[PDB]
Amino acid sequence: MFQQLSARLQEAIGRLRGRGRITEEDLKATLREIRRALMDADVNLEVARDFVERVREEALGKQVLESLTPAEVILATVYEALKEALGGEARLPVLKDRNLWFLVGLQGSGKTTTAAKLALYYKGKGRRPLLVAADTQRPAAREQLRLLGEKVGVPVLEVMDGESPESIRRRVEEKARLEARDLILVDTAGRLQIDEPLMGELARLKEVLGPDEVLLVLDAMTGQEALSVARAFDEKVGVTGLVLTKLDGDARGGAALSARHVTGKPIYFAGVSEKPEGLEPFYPERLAGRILGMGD
Ligand SMILES: [Cl-]
Ligand SMILES: [Cl-]
Ligand SMILES: [Mn+2]
């Protein structure tokens, strides 16, 4: 993702090289070019205007009009604004002695494989995770998680067809006690579309299990729809953080750049490949650098 935006931002910066000091009108032209690059990447007008305004303020504060290398000043201020847009500092869910987290999202989001990859990540960090396959309607969805848990070496409790939330809670508590589990990852039902009956189920399960995090998994390649999905889950269930999958796919890029501003939720993890280790903690500064051609 973000190949076109990357090329357009780098080109806007590059057009400032080899010209000496620039004028106020030159600076305004570059700012318009940056806003256009963002909007072509499907960033909305409000988000893009705010971004450019931050670039303008910071560049003026760094003396851009007096610099012999204004391209470098713009590079630095775009880098900071991108790093800010994407979340600022890297963030992860808080671990306490015991933890129960939901994963929520649509079928095509990579939610179930994300649950397994998260479990593997945390097992490698010394946690003792339990996966819970919580689709009370679809046995195949539960079996998919069983098999992935087997592959990553993490136990899986599967709910029963039509099992009540209270029964799920009892069985999860029992297994977690017998197996000394300290991180419970509940993979909730995935559907192709949002559904009143489904949202009512997720909200009820949340009341009964009391998760401390609700992680919404979104396929980043779905564009502005991902922010609409995020709004629906946050309104009907309540979300604490995001996981963006398929960030390596061919797509424009603005969900990720538009998420802090629009949703107020941190992006915790990024899916950057299909390998079992392809899910990594999200680092806003490293994505910002890579968009601008810096680093790896
Ligand atoms: Cl479906
Ligand atoms: Cl999605
Ligand atoms: Mn209720």
mmCIF file of C-alpha atoms and ligand atoms in Angstrom:
data_model
loop_
_atom_site.group_PDB
_atom_site.id
_atom_site.type_symbol
_atom_site.label_atom_id
_atom_site.label_comp_id
_atom_site.label_asym_id
_atom_site.label_seq_id
_atom_site.Cartn_x
_atom_site.Cartn_y
_atom_site.Cartn_z
ATOM 1 C CA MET A 1 0.000 0.000 0.000
ATOM 2 C CA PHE A 2 0.968 3.688 -0.240
ATOM 3 C CA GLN A 3 3.218 3.317 -3.310
ATOM 4 C CA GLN A 4 1.502 6.132 -5.236
ATOM 5 C CA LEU A 5 1.395 8.453 -2.205
ATOM 6 C CA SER A 6 5.040 7.685 -1.494
ATOM 7 C CA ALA A 7 6.055 8.554 -5.064
ATOM 8 C CA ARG A 8 3.951 11.730 -5.020
ATOM 9 C CA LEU A 9 5.235 13.006 -1.669
ATOM 10 C CA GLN A 10 8.845 12.242 -2.648
ATOM 11 C CA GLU A 11 8.307 14.054 -5.984
ATOM 12 C CA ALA A 12 6.847 17.161 -4.233
ATOM 13 C CA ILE A 13 9.884 17.272 -1.943
ATOM 14 C CA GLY A 14 12.297 16.616 -4.810
ATOM 15 C CA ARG A 15 10.967 19.543 -6.899
ATOM 16 C CA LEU A 16 12.372 21.887 -4.187
ATOM 17 C CA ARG A 17 15.975 20.695 -4.747
ATOM 18 C CA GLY A 18 18.574 22.597 -6.842
ATOM 19 C CA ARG A 19 16.734 25.936 -6.732
ATOM 20 C CA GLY A 20 18.398 27.805 -3.899
ATOM 21 C CA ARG A 21 16.244 29.523 -1.283
ATOM 22 C CA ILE A 22 12.520 29.542 -2.071
ATOM 23 C CA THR A 23 9.817 32.171 -1.923
ATOM 24 C CA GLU A 24 6.510 32.243 -0.059
ATOM 25 C CA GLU A 25 4.693 31.424 -3.298
ATOM 26 C CA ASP A 26 7.015 28.425 -3.856
ATOM 27 C CA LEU A 27 6.165 27.170 -0.345
ATOM 28 C CA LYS A 28 2.433 27.522 -0.998
ATOM 29 C CA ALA A 29 2.790 25.511 -4.224
ATOM 30 C CA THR A 30 4.491 22.677 -2.376
ATOM 31 C CA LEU A 31 1.808 22.674 0.322
ATOM 32 C CA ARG A 32 -0.943 22.418 -2.325
ATOM 33 C CA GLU A 33 0.983 19.536 -3.945
ATOM 34 C CA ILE A 34 1.154 17.698 -0.631
ATOM 35 C CA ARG A 35 -2.594 18.177 -0.026
ATOM 36 C CA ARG A 36 -3.355 16.846 -3.489
ATOM 37 C CA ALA A 37 -1.117 13.818 -2.938
ATOM 38 C CA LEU A 38 -3.003 13.018 0.288
ATOM 39 C CA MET A 39 -6.435 13.528 -1.306
ATOM 40 C CA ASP A 40 -5.465 11.279 -4.261
ATOM 41 C CA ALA A 41 -4.691 8.650 -1.637
ATOM 42 C CA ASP A 42 -8.298 9.029 -0.508
ATOM 43 C CA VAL A 43 -7.572 11.153 2.601
ATOM 44 C CA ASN A 44 -10.647 13.383 3.113
ATOM 45 C CA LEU A 45 -10.464 17.169 2.786
ATOM 46 C CA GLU A 46 -10.558 17.856 6.532
ATOM 47 C CA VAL A 47 -7.751 15.432 7.428
ATOM 48 C CA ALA A 48 -5.613 16.612 4.497
ATOM 49 C CA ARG A 49 -6.077 20.294 5.347
ATOM 50 C CA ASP A 50 -5.090 19.622 8.961
ATOM 51 C CA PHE A 51 -2.013 17.750 7.815
ATOM 52 C CA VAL A 52 -0.867 20.533 5.532
ATOM 53 C CA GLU A 53 -1.521 23.151 8.210
ATOM 54 C CA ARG A 54 0.784 21.211 10.596
ATOM 55 C CA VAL A 55 3.453 21.039 7.844
ATOM 56 C CA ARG A 56 3.116 24.782 7.198
ATOM 57 C CA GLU A 57 3.453 25.769 10.837
ATOM 58 C CA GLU A 58 6.373 23.483 11.513
ATOM 59 C CA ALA A 59 8.239 24.443 8.308
ATOM 60 C CA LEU A 60 7.894 28.161 9.060
ATOM 61 C CA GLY A 61 9.110 27.432 12.598
ATOM 62 C CA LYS A 62 12.189 25.761 11.054
ATOM 63 C CA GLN A 63 12.953 28.780 8.821
ATOM 64 C CA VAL A 64 12.104 27.006 5.592
ATOM 65 C CA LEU A 65 12.198 30.265 3.555
ATOM 66 C CA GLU A 66 15.723 31.030 4.786
ATOM 67 C CA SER A 67 17.147 27.517 4.283
ATOM 68 C CA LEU A 68 19.625 26.661 1.566
ATOM 69 C CA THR A 69 18.001 23.210 1.481
ATOM 70 C CA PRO A 70 14.248 23.795 1.809
ATOM 71 C CA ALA A 71 13.572 20.280 0.462
ATOM 72 C CA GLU A 72 15.170 18.849 3.593
ATOM 73 C CA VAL A 73 13.082 21.090 5.854
ATOM 74 C CA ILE A 74 9.885 19.960 4.088
ATOM 75 C CA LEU A 75 11.042 16.337 4.284
ATOM 76 C CA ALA A 76 11.475 16.621 8.065
ATOM 77 C CA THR A 77 8.117 18.335 8.640
ATOM 78 C CA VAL A 78 6.189 15.909 6.391
ATOM 79 C CA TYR A 79 7.901 13.059 8.243
ATOM 80 C CA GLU A 80 6.742 14.409 11.597
ATOM 81 C CA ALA A 81 3.202 15.043 10.387
ATOM 82 C CA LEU A 82 2.995 11.489 8.947
ATOM 83 C CA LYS A 83 4.352 10.022 12.200
ATOM 84 C CA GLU A 84 1.727 12.018 14.089
ATOM 85 C CA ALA A 85 -1.144 11.077 11.666
ATOM 86 C CA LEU A 86 -0.313 7.368 12.064
ATOM 87 C CA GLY A 87 -0.379 7.551 15.891
ATOM 88 C CA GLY A 88 2.701 9.313 17.091
ATOM 89 C CA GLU A 89 4.377 6.939 19.463
ATOM 90 C CA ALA A 90 4.035 3.143 19.160
ATOM 91 C CA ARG A 91 1.347 1.695 21.447
ATOM 92 C CA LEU A 92 0.325 -1.837 22.520
ATOM 93 C CA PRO A 93 -2.505 -3.164 24.689
ATOM 94 C CA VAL A 94 -1.714 -3.084 28.443
ATOM 95 C CA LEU A 95 -0.825 -6.470 29.951
ATOM 96 C CA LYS A 96 -1.880 -7.149 33.499
ATOM 97 C CA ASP A 97 -1.668 -10.408 35.522
ATOM 98 C CA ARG A 98 -4.692 -11.691 33.634
ATOM 99 C CA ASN A 99 -6.171 -10.344 30.375
ATOM 100 C CA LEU A 100 -9.263 -11.144 28.298
ATOM 101 C CA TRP A 101 -9.416 -9.506 24.884
ATOM 102 C CA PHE A 102 -11.934 -9.687 22.077
ATOM 103 C CA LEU A 103 -11.051 -9.693 18.390
ATOM 104 C CA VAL A 104 -13.920 -8.303 16.300
ATOM 105 C CA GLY A 105 -14.338 -7.546 12.586
ATOM 106 C CA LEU A 106 -15.712 -8.774 9.305
ATOM 107 C CA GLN A 107 -15.088 -12.177 7.778
ATOM 108 C CA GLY A 108 -12.614 -10.887 5.102
ATOM 109 C CA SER A 109 -10.548 -8.949 7.554
ATOM 110 C CA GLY A 110 -8.049 -11.681 8.502
ATOM 111 C CA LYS A 111 -9.505 -11.664 12.052
ATOM 112 C CA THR A 112 -9.206 -15.426 12.733
ATOM 113 C CA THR A 113 -5.634 -15.754 11.462
ATOM 114 C CA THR A 114 -4.780 -12.542 13.335
ATOM 115 C CA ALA A 115 -6.032 -14.141 16.561
ATOM 116 C CA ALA A 116 -3.632 -17.076 16.071
ATOM 117 C CA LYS A 117 -0.692 -14.806 15.109
ATOM 118 C CA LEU A 118 -1.308 -12.630 18.169
ATOM 119 C CA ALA A 119 -1.389 -15.686 20.375
ATOM 120 C CA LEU A 120 1.977 -16.793 18.907
ATOM 121 C CA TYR A 121 3.471 -13.304 19.381
ATOM 122 C CA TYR A 122 2.493 -13.185 23.019
ATOM 123 C CA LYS A 123 3.568 -16.799 23.695
ATOM 124 C CA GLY A 124 7.025 -15.804 22.470
ATOM 125 C CA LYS A 125 6.961 -12.878 24.929
ATOM 126 C CA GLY A 126 6.343 -15.366 27.788
ATOM 127 C CA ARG A 127 2.563 -15.188 28.065
ATOM 128 C CA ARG A 128 0.395 -18.346 28.319
ATOM 129 C CA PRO A 129 -2.421 -17.566 25.801
ATOM 130 C CA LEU A 130 -5.784 -19.320 25.272
ATOM 131 C CA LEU A 131 -7.694 -18.914 21.993
ATOM 132 C CA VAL A 132 -11.514 -18.987 22.209
ATOM 133 C CA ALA A 133 -13.416 -19.826 18.997
ATOM 134 C CA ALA A 134 -16.635 -17.951 19.869
ATOM 135 C CA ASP A 135 -18.851 -18.338 16.709
ATOM 136 C CA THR A 136 -21.992 -20.019 18.155
ATOM 137 C CA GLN A 137 -23.495 -20.530 14.644
ATOM 138 C CA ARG A 138 -20.742 -21.759 12.350
ATOM 139 C CA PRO A 139 -18.750 -24.909 13.215
ATOM 140 C CA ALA A 140 -16.381 -24.355 10.296
ATOM 141 C CA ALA A 141 -15.278 -20.992 11.737
ATOM 142 C CA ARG A 142 -14.446 -22.643 15.043
ATOM 143 C CA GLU A 143 -12.584 -25.519 13.402
ATOM 144 C CA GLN A 144 -10.482 -23.022 11.390
ATOM 145 C CA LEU A 145 -9.209 -21.543 14.689
ATOM 146 C CA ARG A 146 -8.639 -25.013 16.202
ATOM 147 C CA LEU A 147 -6.319 -25.888 13.324
ATOM 148 C CA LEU A 148 -4.450 -22.575 13.454
ATOM 149 C CA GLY A 149 -3.995 -22.973 17.215
ATOM 150 C CA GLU A 150 -2.546 -26.416 16.626
ATOM 151 C CA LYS A 151 -0.095 -24.906 14.103
ATOM 152 C CA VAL A 152 1.117 -22.220 16.500
ATOM 153 C CA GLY A 153 1.057 -24.487 19.595
ATOM 154 C CA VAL A 154 -1.627 -22.571 21.512
ATOM 155 C CA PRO A 155 -4.717 -24.211 23.104
ATOM 156 C CA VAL A 156 -8.175 -23.501 21.663
ATOM 157 C CA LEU A 157 -11.560 -23.723 23.422
ATOM 158 C CA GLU A 158 -14.433 -23.963 20.926
ATOM 159 C CA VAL A 159 -17.899 -22.832 21.955
ATOM 160 C CA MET A 160 -20.908 -25.057 21.285
ATOM 161 C CA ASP A 161 -23.679 -24.326 18.820
ATOM 162 C CA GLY A 162 -26.089 -21.896 20.470
ATOM 163 C CA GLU A 163 -24.066 -21.828 23.711
ATOM 164 C CA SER A 164 -25.124 -19.082 26.134
ATOM 165 C CA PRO A 165 -22.655 -16.349 27.093
ATOM 166 C CA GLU A 166 -22.869 -17.480 30.727
ATOM 167 C CA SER A 167 -21.911 -21.037 29.730
ATOM 168 C CA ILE A 168 -19.015 -19.741 27.626
ATOM 169 C CA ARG A 169 -17.809 -17.728 30.599
ATOM 170 C CA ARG A 170 -17.907 -20.796 32.897
ATOM 171 C CA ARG A 171 -15.989 -22.998 30.501
ATOM 172 C CA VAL A 172 -13.391 -20.345 29.660
ATOM 173 C CA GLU A 173 -12.790 -19.675 33.390
ATOM 174 C CA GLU A 174 -12.374 -23.378 34.110
ATOM 175 C CA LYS A 175 -9.914 -24.008 31.288
ATOM 176 C CA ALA A 176 -7.951 -20.887 32.072
ATOM 177 C CA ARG A 177 -7.587 -21.977 35.698
ATOM 178 C CA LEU A 178 -6.598 -25.594 34.923
ATOM 179 C CA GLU A 179 -4.088 -24.516 32.293
ATOM 180 C CA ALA A 180 -2.738 -21.386 34.076
ATOM 181 C CA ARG A 181 -3.674 -19.237 31.057
ATOM 182 C CA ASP A 182 -2.902 -15.499 31.475
ATOM 183 C CA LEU A 183 -4.072 -14.071 28.125
ATOM 184 C CA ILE A 184 -7.467 -15.055 26.710
ATOM 185 C CA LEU A 185 -8.069 -14.099 23.060
ATOM 186 C CA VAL A 186 -11.754 -14.377 22.045
ATOM 187 C CA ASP A 187 -12.219 -14.675 18.280
ATOM 188 C CA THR A 188 -15.837 -13.483 17.817
ATOM 189 C CA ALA A 189 -18.039 -14.278 14.842
ATOM 190 C CA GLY A 190 -17.065 -12.910 11.427
ATOM 191 C CA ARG A 191 -19.714 -12.094 8.811
ATOM 192 C CA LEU A 192 -19.419 -10.498 5.382
ATOM 193 C CA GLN A 193 -21.704 -7.631 6.465
ATOM 194 C CA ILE A 194 -22.740 -5.996 9.751
ATOM 195 C CA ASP A 195 -25.939 -7.559 11.134
ATOM 196 C CA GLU A 196 -28.251 -6.327 13.994
ATOM 197 C CA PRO A 197 -28.501 -9.828 15.472
ATOM 198 C CA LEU A 198 -24.689 -10.122 15.387
ATOM 199 C CA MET A 199 -23.978 -6.779 16.924
ATOM 200 C CA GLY A 200 -26.493 -7.542 19.671
ATOM 201 C CA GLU A 201 -24.687 -10.823 20.355
ATOM 202 C CA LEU A 202 -21.260 -9.113 20.529
ATOM 203 C CA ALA A 203 -22.516 -6.503 22.874
ATOM 204 C CA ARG A 204 -24.115 -9.115 25.154
ATOM 205 C CA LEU A 205 -20.957 -11.286 25.129
ATOM 206 C CA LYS A 206 -19.012 -8.160 26.104
ATOM 207 C CA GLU A 207 -21.266 -7.541 29.119
ATOM 208 C CA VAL A 208 -20.904 -11.152 30.305
ATOM 209 C CA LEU A 209 -17.129 -11.660 29.675
ATOM 210 C CA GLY A 210 -15.971 -8.121 30.491
ATOM 211 C CA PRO A 211 -12.965 -7.864 28.119
ATOM 212 C CA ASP A 212 -10.327 -5.298 28.908
ATOM 213 C CA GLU A 213 -9.531 -4.757 25.224
ATOM 214 C CA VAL A 214 -11.676 -5.018 22.116
ATOM 215 C CA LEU A 215 -9.431 -5.168 19.059
ATOM 216 C CA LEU A 216 -11.042 -4.408 15.699
ATOM 217 C CA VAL A 217 -9.313 -6.116 12.816
ATOM 218 C CA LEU A 218 -9.607 -4.266 9.474
ATOM 219 C CA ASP A 219 -8.340 -5.165 5.960
ATOM 220 C CA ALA A 220 -6.476 -2.007 5.077
ATOM 221 C CA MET A 221 -7.039 -2.646 1.367
ATOM 222 C CA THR A 222 -10.775 -1.871 1.760
ATOM 223 C CA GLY A 223 -10.101 1.879 1.938
ATOM 224 C CA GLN A 224 -12.579 4.378 3.498
ATOM 225 C CA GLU A 225 -14.999 1.499 4.157
ATOM 226 C CA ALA A 226 -12.680 0.378 6.917
ATOM 227 C CA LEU A 227 -13.403 3.654 8.786
ATOM 228 C CA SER A 228 -17.153 3.083 8.329
ATOM 229 C CA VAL A 229 -16.735 -0.470 9.734
ATOM 230 C CA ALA A 230 -14.785 1.041 12.611
ATOM 231 C CA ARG A 231 -17.535 3.543 13.390
ATOM 232 C CA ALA A 232 -20.200 0.778 13.385
ATOM 233 C CA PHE A 233 -18.256 -1.512 15.719
ATOM 234 C CA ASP A 234 -17.337 1.369 18.031
ATOM 235 C CA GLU A 235 -20.941 2.595 18.234
ATOM 236 C CA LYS A 236 -22.601 -0.797 18.668
ATOM 237 C CA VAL A 237 -19.969 -2.713 20.668
ATOM 238 C CA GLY A 238 -17.125 -0.355 21.744
ATOM 239 C CA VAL A 239 -13.575 -0.802 20.451
ATOM 240 C CA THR A 240 -10.245 -0.052 22.192
ATOM 241 C CA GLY A 241 -7.710 -0.474 19.375
ATOM 242 C CA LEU A 242 -7.155 -1.481 15.756
ATOM 243 C CA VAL A 243 -5.217 -4.134 13.863
ATOM 244 C CA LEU A 244 -4.650 -3.374 10.159
ATOM 245 C CA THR A 245 -4.074 -6.381 7.922
ATOM 246 C CA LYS A 246 -2.841 -6.661 4.334
ATOM 247 C CA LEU A 247 -0.751 -3.495 4.548
ATOM 248 C CA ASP A 248 1.464 -5.033 1.847
ATOM 249 C CA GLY A 249 -1.440 -5.130 -0.669
ATOM 250 C CA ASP A 250 -1.977 -2.783 -3.631
ATOM 251 C CA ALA A 251 -4.229 0.017 -2.384
ATOM 252 C CA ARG A 252 -4.259 3.815 -1.920
ATOM 253 C CA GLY A 253 -3.422 4.205 1.959
ATOM 254 C CA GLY A 254 -5.566 6.868 3.790
ATOM 255 C CA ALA A 255 -7.409 4.664 6.311
ATOM 256 C CA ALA A 256 -4.197 4.272 8.229
ATOM 257 C CA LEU A 257 -3.313 7.932 7.784
ATOM 258 C CA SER A 258 -6.936 8.978 8.590
ATOM 259 C CA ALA A 259 -7.567 6.609 11.614
ATOM 260 C CA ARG A 260 -6.233 8.609 14.694
ATOM 261 C CA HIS A 261 -8.038 11.759 13.490
ATOM 262 C CA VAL A 262 -11.344 10.088 12.580
ATOM 263 C CA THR A 263 -11.668 7.183 15.092
ATOM 264 C CA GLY A 264 -9.443 8.233 17.963
ATOM 265 C CA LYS A 265 -8.281 4.614 18.276
ATOM 266 C CA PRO A 266 -4.626 3.468 18.290
ATOM 267 C CA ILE A 267 -3.381 1.069 15.643
ATOM 268 C CA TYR A 268 -1.728 -1.640 17.741
ATOM 269 C CA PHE A 269 -0.580 -4.194 15.164
ATOM 270 C CA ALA A 270 0.116 -4.318 11.487
ATOM 271 C CA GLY A 271 -0.121 -7.344 9.244
ATOM 272 C CA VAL A 272 2.738 -7.044 6.815
ATOM 273 C CA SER A 273 2.875 -10.589 5.325
ATOM 274 C CA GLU A 274 1.286 -14.071 5.322
ATOM 275 C CA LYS A 275 4.002 -15.730 7.381
ATOM 276 C CA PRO A 276 2.985 -16.703 10.943
ATOM 277 C CA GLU A 277 5.374 -13.920 12.107
ATOM 278 C CA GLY A 278 3.817 -11.358 9.669
ATOM 279 C CA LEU A 279 1.906 -9.599 12.432
ATOM 280 C CA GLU A 280 4.089 -7.077 14.174
ATOM 281 C CA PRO A 281 3.618 -4.219 16.648
ATOM 282 C CA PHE A 282 2.805 -1.072 14.663
ATOM 283 C CA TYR A 283 5.463 1.675 14.598
ATOM 284 C CA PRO A 284 4.181 4.976 13.190
ATOM 285 C CA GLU A 285 7.683 6.393 12.829
ATOM 286 C CA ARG A 286 8.903 3.452 10.727
ATOM 287 C CA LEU A 287 5.985 3.592 8.321
ATOM 288 C CA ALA A 288 6.364 7.382 8.030
ATOM 289 C CA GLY A 289 10.045 6.997 7.174
ATOM 290 C CA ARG A 290 9.377 4.277 4.599
ATOM 291 C CA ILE A 291 6.680 6.332 2.879
ATOM 292 C CA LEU A 292 9.314 9.103 2.442
ATOM 293 C CA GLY A 293 11.990 6.773 1.121
ATOM 294 C CA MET A 294 14.070 6.741 4.327
ATOM 295 C CA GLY A 295 15.276 3.653 6.029
ATOM 296 C CA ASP A 296 14.603 0.119 5.067
HETATM 297 CL CL CL B 1 -21.557 -14.112 6.121
HETATM 298 CL CL CL B 2 -12.314 -5.357 6.993
HETATM 299 MN MN MN B 3 -27.222 -5.828 27.586
#
